[PDB]
């Protein structure tokens, strides 16, 4: 059977194999996809091909290596299929009609497949280009418009010869285009073409083989485009954003404009881009919503993805010696920010939050270009944020939530520039304390900030005991001076500070971590009793577990005696139905990092659970609901589940005390909604012994695995971020000792259940505190089978 193997192959790409065998494999799937006459799972075969020819399989490009390794595919077969979609005379036979999904959906696939195997059409059959156009062209008429155009864009290879180049065919596209008014049914193909072709010429000019038979395609002012060709596409794009809104996926529509820039002859183009931003200016304004606010947003983003796209492909090539003056200069990155900054700032305040998240996400792309301008952006974003935390926006909801998104989509970069980074302690201990219990939304957007600051920063005291220290005296004074400066019109370039004082401010800023976690934990226990739900309960546990991993032993060992402390003495689990998750799990994540903490935490959950049982908890029967007199017993039981699950080998010490307590928990305590809980104890303990998992996630290892203490932005940009001595992960591997307790248990609980149940087969049909007990033992048995699941072998029955 074909379809099966075609999959086990998919599974095999996960390791490696010879390019000489790809030549083979690809050839199979190129011709396989194009079968006719039977039921075929095409989507699969065109996807094999597309993955075999991947142009970025981990920085490696397999279309290059397959071109170089002698792959050549028949174009007549592909074009011959895509042409069954033309008007075959005698209606009685025409098989394919667009319009009707089932058909258009095949066509869209063939077209995709061809795009994939365009580069393997014989560069050497000189009259393959000209032959194929002279055919499609004669086929073009109003009734074919729809099927011909797309074909050309995905079945004709970008060739370039001495006499007949592909750009030879441009003057004909700007004959159709420029004859109908803006029409997405047409335009989308024109942009896709002159763009994936302009991308091509650029790609080919750099590094590789600057040829393909002709470097006889000159770049200049406006990419490969005439003066009037460029001029036209500009006023057409303006037409789209101001008048006729005719564009889809914009990534494609933007190409031509990006790949027509010439680093050494921009000017005349930037002149054309500026007047396009000055036109578009008013239509972004937060109170001018219309049919356009989508196109302008989806474009201003598609364009700055597709520019940064190019830059990071060239900077990958000037890591190969080849500058090329076609390349984008430090001064392009500058004039790009000049243009789209008011534009991006207006859009991000827009009334639709989705249409804003587009303009707001552009800040990250611009900052990666590390332009000289960088300050202009950090300047806005930080005022907008400091104003918001000072309640200067309290009358306007959007500015508050907006400028917190601006700031989040940009945190990681602030941790770098050695000036801004100072603010980050303050801005964090401010977010934590401003976490609202009534505004579900503000809180979700604050956790966003809090977790982003923790993901790229080590919670560490970086003071060498330097006496001047303190947060005030040394950090606050500076932070206020920077802000005063920034507020009064001045920028950060004009801001002069001593490299001495500014490093006092930074180091002294890393002191507040302790006094601020006492305030985060306090805000967690307040949130245990809120009808926040789901999405946001989780995201909050990410923030508590990320904050832990970015913590040195000094601080963590504090955080631990602070969860421990607050978990016991708290007045915070009242309200009906609580989010235990928000507090039990952050405990488990302490035990992951420090198994030593388990020996005593567990023995305390047990002499506190036996306590609650003995005083009437789960005495009162009910399906459907957890009785509120139980809520405490249920906290301690969830904790015990969540915290065993992460105990691992440290559980070997108090093995016998556990088993004998589990048997106690099932002798006493019957109650169908508590038994779905108590029966999980057995699983969270079998899984923890034999499940093979990670254990260490710390931002920086051991407390000492010194890269030094210029170690902020989490190495996220350093190339040492991934040499093997940094990434020294711990891992729990099940030892012969654990597997052996693992099995002791399995048989001891497995018996316990089967006895207590083979007993109850002296049947009381009434009781109903009988069907409660049989369900109990069948749940304990069940969760005994899971977690303990890693010791079983599918194949055992063959042997």
């Amino acid at each position: 059977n074909v379809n099966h193997w075609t999959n086990e192959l998919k599974n095999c790409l996960h390791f490696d194999f010879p390019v000489a065998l790809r030549k083979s494999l690809a050839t199979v799937y190129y011709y396989l996809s194009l079968v006719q006459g039977q039921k075929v799972y095409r989507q699969m075969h065109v996807d094999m091909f597309e993955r075999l020819v991947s142009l970025d399989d981990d920085r490696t490009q397999f279309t290059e290596l397959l071109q170089k390794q002698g792959l050549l595919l028949d174009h007549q077969i592909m074009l011959n299929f895509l042409c069954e979609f033309l008007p075959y005379p005698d209606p009685d036979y025409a098989r394919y009609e667009l319009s009707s999904k089932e058909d258009l959906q095949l066509f869209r696939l063939l077209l995709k497949h061809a795009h994939n195997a365009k580069p393997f059409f014989d560069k050497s059959k000189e009259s393959l280009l000209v032959d194929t156009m002279n055919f499609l062209l004669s086929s073009l008429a109003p009734s074919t418009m729809m099927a011909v155009m797309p074909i050309v864009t995905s079945v004709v290879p970008y060739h370039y010869h001495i006499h007949s180049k592909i750009i030879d065919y441009f003057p004909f596209c700007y004959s159709i285009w420029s004859s109908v008014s803006a029409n997405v049914a047409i335009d989308t193909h024109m942009y896709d073409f002159v763009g994936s072709i302009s991308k091509d010429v650029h790609n080919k000019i750099l590094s590789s083989e600057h040829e393909k038979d002709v470097v006889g395609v000159e770049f200049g002012e406006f990419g490969i485009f005439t003066d009037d060709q460029m001029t036209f596409m500009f006023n057409r794009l303006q037409g789209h954003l101001r008048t006729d809104g005719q564009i889809h996926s914009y990534s494609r529509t933007v190409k031509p404009f990006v790949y027509a820039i010439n680093g050494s002859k921009k000017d005349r183009f930037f002149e054309k881009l500026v007047s396009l931003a000055k036109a578009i200016e008013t239509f972004i304004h937060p109170s001018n919503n219309g049919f356009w606010t989508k196109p302008n947003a989806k474009f201003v983003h598609a364009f700055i993805k597709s520019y940064h796209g190019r830059v990071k492909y060239e900077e990958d090539i000037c890591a190969r010696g080849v500058t090329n003056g076609i390349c984008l200069t430090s001064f392009c990155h500058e004039e790009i920010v000049e243009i789209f900054l008011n534009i991006i700032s207006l859009g991000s305040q827009n009334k639709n939050p989705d249409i804003a998240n587009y303009y707001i996400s552009c800040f990250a792309y611009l900052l990666e270009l590390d332009p000289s301008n960088a300050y202009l952006i950090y300047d806005k974003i930080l005022i907008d944020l400091y104003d918001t935390l000072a309640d200067q926006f309290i009358n306007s909801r959007h500015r508050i939530i907006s400028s917190l998104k601006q700031f989040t989509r940009v945190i990681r970069f602030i941790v770098m520039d050695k000036l801004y980074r100072v603010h980050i302690t303050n801005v964090l201990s401010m977010l934590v304390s401003k976490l609202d219990m009534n505004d579900t939304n503000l809180t979700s957007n604050l956790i966003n900030g809090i977790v982003s600051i923790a993901a790229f920063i080590p919670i560490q005291d970086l003071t060498g005991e330097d006496d001047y220290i303190s947060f005030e005296s040394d950090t606050l004074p500076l932070v206020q001076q920077h802000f005063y400066h920034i507020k009064c019109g001045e920028s950060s370039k004009t801001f002069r500070v001593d490299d001495e004082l500014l490093n006092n401010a930074f180091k002294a800023s890393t002191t507040v971590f302790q006094s601020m976690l006492k305030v985060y934990v306090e805000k967690i226990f307040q949130l245990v009793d809120v009808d926040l739900e789901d999405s946001l309960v989780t995201k909050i546990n990410q923030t508590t577990m990320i904050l832990q991993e970015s913590m040195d032993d000094k601080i963590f060992n504090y955080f631990a005696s602070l969860l421990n402390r607050n978990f016991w003495s708290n007045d915070s689990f009242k309200e009906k139905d609580p989010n235990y998750e928000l507090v039990t799990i952050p405990l488990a994540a302490l035990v992951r990092r420090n198994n030593g903490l388990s020996k005593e935490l567990v023995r305390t959950l047990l002499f506190h659970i036996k306590e609650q049982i003995k005083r009437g908890a789960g005495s009162v029967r009910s399906t459907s609901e957890i009785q509120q007199r139980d809520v405490k017993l249920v906290l301690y039981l969830t904790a015990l589940n969540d915290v065993l699950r992460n105990c691992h080998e440290s559980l070997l010490e108090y093995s016998d005390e556990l088993i004998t307590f589990m048997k106690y928990l099932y002798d006493n305590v019957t109650n169908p909604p508590l038994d779905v809980i108590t029966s999980i104890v057995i699983h969270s303990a079998l899984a923890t012994l034999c499940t093979t998992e990670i254990t260490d996630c710390r931002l920086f290892p051991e407390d000492s695995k010194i890269p030094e203490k210029d170690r902020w932005g989490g190495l996220q940009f350093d190339p040492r971020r991934f040499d093997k001595q940094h990434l020294s992960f711990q891992w729990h591997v099940p030892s012969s000792d654990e597997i052996t307790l693992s099995i002791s248990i399995l048989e001891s609980l497995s018996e316990y259940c089967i006895n207590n149940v083979e007993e109850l087969m002296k049947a009381p049909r009434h009781d109903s505190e009988y069907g409660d007990m049989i369900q109990k033992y069948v749940l304990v048995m069940t969760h005994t089978l899971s977690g303990s699941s890693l010791l079983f072998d599918p194949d055992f029955n063959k042997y």
Partner: protein, 997 residues
């Protein structure tokens, strides 16, 4: 063996594990657990049938015991104490940047890889004797009667067929037997449940592959089509209907470039005899399957022919033999089927009849396609499109372009036909062109196929087409409708007729047609004209002596019908035909039909009678000429025959809508060569291309005439009034020309209309000081069209002459049609912005500004200023700008004049009205400069001493300060501070209406 490897502890399939005490220990325990769950199941179904809570907890204990083997899949994804890989990826990954991750992320990423290496391990296996026992139990539960039980069991039996091999077989051979039972044990809710099972994604899918068992099953679901009592039978129909839509079979030799398997061809010598052996078994596995369906086919026709009357699920059969006696990839055309499918016309039921046709027409178009493919079933999926009657033509042929043109006008000695949509040509010639042969053959088929078609024409009596069309009319009264499915059936009767099998003679369809033409019944006329369209799709059928009996009947019939006496009900139908027919058949297959609508005894010329009648043609001739657009269009006549002078609108408008179409037919540029073509596009003035569609000189001449014939008649209204206007010839022409322009500016004809604007179309239109009130009468909106022509497909060089037409030095000519050209500009600018050379961008701005000053019309000084802002918005460069500001604020600045004077001036002086209107527009062109430019305060200050004067300029200076104070509203908390000038006060009056004091 093993390629997944996940630290299985007991060694990765070394059977380092089999020699491990700890490993027989472990499975000996899962065995006990398994044998114990069965011990409990039997103990419950015996002691506790009426309990749901128990059985749910057991059914989860089995969803686990069967799945949680290598992995952990229930509990798999509960938020636990690990940071989520998907979350962290969002926080840290920038795109176009390789893994910029912090240490924390790398660590989950790795753990995430281990955990996925575990789930990779295919747990799929062979049923373990005990495992078969428990799967049988899980069925008696998914076969239970309580929804609170059977619904989790079904969901639980699906997680179990994912895990066992050919377990679907175990399931069916338990279902069917215990459904056949639950039927002879009566109305059971166990039938209701078994049907719920059969609708499970995973089962309902494997059903269309069980050729053995679907025999017995369809006959069980049929017996089930009796709501003896429940929702059953509703479910049995949905299911039997779902079934007709699956199944089939593929004989056809995968049209594969043999290069789809070669590259992977092992050295192994003929140890690839195996391949040619598989080829043979997957070829009689197939041929057995194919026979099982024919056995089912015939065993149903049994229960349909022999079962005196079963009622209206008479329908499954027909809905099915059809997707079967016409599938191919085999399928031996049975003649006993074609008989039974037709003898179901005797139930005189609308739905059955609609289907007998839909079926008879496919069951033939299949037998037909065997002859055309010569039994080479493969030849369908080979794009060397066989059919013996298709012919390819070389188009590069030095000479071809004029074969076409002079062969499309040929109706008597026709050489080729393009039924359908004619693509090749139009743009250029050179391609090969698929075409069809004249007096198309019938072709031969073997005897089995022959006696089948005989058994149709021997059944298509004068009486049977009587019964069947009648019905199609009555079911049709509700809807209207046309469906080609109807016409493509009549062409079929025609093939059958004079090819031998029917013998009904065409003179029988001429009555059947003339018959259904009651000038009254709409759904009855629709049947008549559905018939006509068939007689024209029945030239793919011999007899040149019948193709003359039919050309003769048709000129006779179109006479009775269209030659006077025509309701908006007929017109509704025939006009439907005109847009359709020419697209499903080349109309030259008929000498009379087309050469009838073009016989134009219909366009009178003046009104002191009743002129006459209607578009009792025009709109139907047009909708044929629209659908050909290329072919047949020799119309030397029509152009010399058009009117324009016509008194009525319904005609004036229609003569225009027709000319529009007549022009789009001579505008296709179809060139000689692709090469000859691209050399024209290359050498064009605009770095762009050729005007696509270009009106050919001999027509550019016609049109120019109609405009300059109307300029000749400007004496015709030397001084008449609106009432003696609608009656002049000058109006009639003018109205027609207008309706024409309206229809050019719409759609694909725009590129045709442009050359005429500058000299013809815009001088016209502004036929409006040629009377405003004359437009209100014969309701024409010129203003809305002239200006709506500001946007549109203009080309680099055409812009030139258009900006020169506006901004005319002859401007001064018009009067408040001035605020018109000024609004056309405001629109052009928005659609030619970024495309205008700073030269043009100026010729405009110097016109606009020359209007802030034109003595006389106060109306326009204001419309000019409102427009000058549209300019100064895209004008950020600061020296064009700051040099205007100065030009304007020189006519006012300071107290050039003392108080008493400002009052006097503000009311009369135009040079100062302009200066304040202008300087006003500039400020209103920067609506939201987020931090405010200091040239704005200082220049509102110069404007405030003037908005303090009541008069005409001091008024449009209050506009400018209120307009402003308004849009600055939300940014005002802040803008206040850039107004040191206690000329904040100076801005308080400003807005005054009558309601303020």
């Amino acid at each position: 063996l093993d390629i997944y490897t996940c630290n299985y502890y007991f060694g990765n399939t070394t059977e380092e594990k089999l020699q491990n005490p700890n490993y027989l220990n472990v499975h000996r325990v899962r065995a006990r657990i398994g044998h114990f769950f069965h011990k409990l199941y039997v103990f419950l179904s015996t002691n506790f049938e009426n309990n749901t809570n128990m059985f749910q907890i057991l059914l989860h204990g089995l969803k686990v015991w069967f799945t949680d083997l290598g992995q952990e899949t229930v509990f798999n994804e509960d938020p636990n104490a690990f940071i989520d890989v998907d979350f962290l990826e969002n926080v840290q990954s920038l795109s176009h940047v390789n893994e910029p991750f912090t240490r924390t992320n790398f660590a989950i990423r790795a753990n995430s890889l281990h955990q996925s290496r575990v789930l990779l391990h295919s747990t799929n296996r062979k049923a373990s004797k005990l495992e078969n026992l428990l799967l049988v139990d899980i069925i008696q539960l998914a076969t239970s009667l309580y929804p609170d039980i059977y619904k989790p069991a079904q969901g639980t039996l699906v997680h179990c067929m994912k895990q066992l091999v050919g377990s679907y077989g175990v399931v069916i051979n338990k279902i069917i037997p215990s459904l056949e039972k639950a039927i002879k044990d009566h109305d059971y809710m166990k039938i209701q449940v078994i049907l719920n099972v059969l609708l499970i994604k995973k089962i309902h899918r494997k059903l269309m592959t069980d050729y053995k068992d679907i025999g017995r099953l369809i006959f069980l679901l049929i017996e089930c089509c009796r709501v003896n009592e429940l929702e059953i039978g509703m479910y049995a129909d949905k299911i039997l209907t779902d079934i007709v839509i699956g199944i089939k079979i593929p004989s056809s030799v995968c049209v594969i470039s043999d290069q789809a398997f070669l590259p992977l061809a092992p050295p192994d010598g003929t140890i690839n005899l195996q391949v040619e052996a598989v080829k043979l078994a997957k070829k009689k596995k197939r041929e057995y399957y194919l026979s099982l369906l024919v056995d089912l086919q015939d065993k149903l026709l049994d229960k349909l022919d022999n079962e005196k009357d079963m009622g209206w699920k008479i329908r499954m059969f027909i809905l099915r033999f059809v997707t079967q006696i016409q599938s191919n990839l085999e399928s031996k055309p049975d003649k006993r089927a074609v008989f039974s499918i037709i003898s179901q016309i005797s139930t005189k039921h609308p739905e059955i009849i609609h289907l007998v046709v839909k079926s008879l027409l496919s069951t033939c178009n299949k037998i037909i396609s065997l002859s055309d493919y010569e039994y080479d079933i493969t030849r369908a999926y080979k794009n060397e499109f066989n059919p013996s009657f298709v012919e390819i033509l070389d188009t590069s042929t030095t000479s071809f372009p004029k074969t076409f043109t002079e062969e499309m006008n040929n109706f008597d000695n026709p050489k080729y036909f393009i039924d359908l949509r004619a693509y090749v040509g139009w743009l250029c010639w050179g391609r090969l062109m698929y075409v069809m042969s004249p007096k198309a053959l019938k072709l031969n088929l073997r005897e089995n196929e022959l006696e089948v078609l005989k058994t149709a024409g021997h059944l298509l009596t004068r009486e049977f087409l009587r019964d069947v069309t009648m019905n199609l009319v009555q079911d049709n009264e509700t809807r209207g409708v046309f469906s080609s499915g109807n016409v493509s059936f009549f062409s079929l009767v025609i093939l059958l007729i004079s090819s031998g099998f029917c013998e009904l003679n065409m003179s029988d369809l001429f009555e059947l047609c003339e018959s259904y033409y009651n000038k009254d019944d709409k759904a009855s006329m629709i049947m008549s004209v559905e018939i006509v369209a068939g007689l024209v799709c029945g030239s793919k059928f011999m007899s040149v002596s019948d193709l003359d009996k039919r050309d003769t009947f048709i000129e006779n019939f179109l006479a009775k019908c269209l030659d006077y006496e025509l309701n908006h009900d007929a017109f509704e139908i025939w006009s439907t035909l005109a847009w359709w027919l020419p697209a499903v058949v080349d109309l030259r297959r008929s000498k009379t039909f087309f050469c009838h609508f073009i016989n134009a005894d219909g366009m009178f010329d003046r009104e002191s009678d009743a002129a006459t009648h209607q578009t009792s043609k025009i709109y139907m001739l047009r909708s044929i000429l629209m659908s050909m657009e290329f072919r047949a269009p020799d119309v030397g006549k029509l152009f010399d025959e058009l009117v324009f002078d016509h008194p009525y609108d319904q005609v004036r408008q229609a003569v225009a809508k027709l000319l529009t179409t007549l022009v789009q037919n001579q505008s296709n540029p179809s060139i000689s060569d692709p090469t000859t073509l691209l050399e024209a596009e290359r050498n064009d003035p605009d770095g762009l291309g050729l005007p696509l569609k270009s009106v050919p000189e001999k027509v550019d001449a016609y049109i120019k005439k109609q405009f300059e014939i109307i300029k000749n008649l400007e004496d015709s209204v030397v001084g008449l009034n609106p009432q003696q206007f609608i009656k002049t010839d000058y109006f009639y022409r003018t109205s027609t020309i207008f309706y024409w322009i309206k229809e050019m500016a719409r759609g694909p004809n725009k590129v045709l209309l442009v050359p005429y604007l500058v000299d013809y179309v815009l001088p016209f239109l502004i036929g409006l000081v040629k009377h405003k009130d004359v437009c209100a009468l014969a309701s024409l909106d010129p203003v809305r069209l002239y200006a709506g022509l500001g946007y549109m497909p203009i080309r680099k060089n055409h812009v030139a002459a258009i900006v020169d037409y506006v901004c005319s030095s002859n401007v001064a000519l018009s009067s408040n049609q001035t605020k018109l050209q000024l609004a056309f500009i405001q629109h052009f600018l928005s659609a030619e912005l970024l495309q205008l050379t700073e030269e043009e961008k100026n010729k405009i701005l110097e016109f606009v500004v020359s209007n802030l000053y034109n003595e006389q019309f106060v109306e326009v000084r204001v419309r000019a200023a409102s427009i000058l802002s549209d300019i100064v918005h895209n004008w950020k460069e600061e020296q064009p700008l700051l040099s205007l500001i100065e030009r304007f604020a020189k006519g006012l600045d300071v107290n050039k004049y003392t108080s008493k004077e400002r009052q006097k001036l503000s009311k009369t002086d135009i040079k100062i009205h302009g200066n304040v209107l202008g300087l006003g527009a500039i400020i209103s062109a920067f609506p939201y400069v987020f931090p405010l430019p200091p040239w704005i305060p200082k220049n509102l200050s110069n404007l405030s001493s003037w908005a303090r004067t009541s008069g005409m300029t001091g008024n449009a200076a209050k506009n400018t300060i209120s307009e402003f104070k308004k849009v600055r509203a939300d940014t005002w908390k802040f803008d206040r501070a850039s107004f040191n000038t206690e000329e904040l006060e100076d801005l308080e009056g400003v807005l005054w209406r009558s309601y303020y004091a």
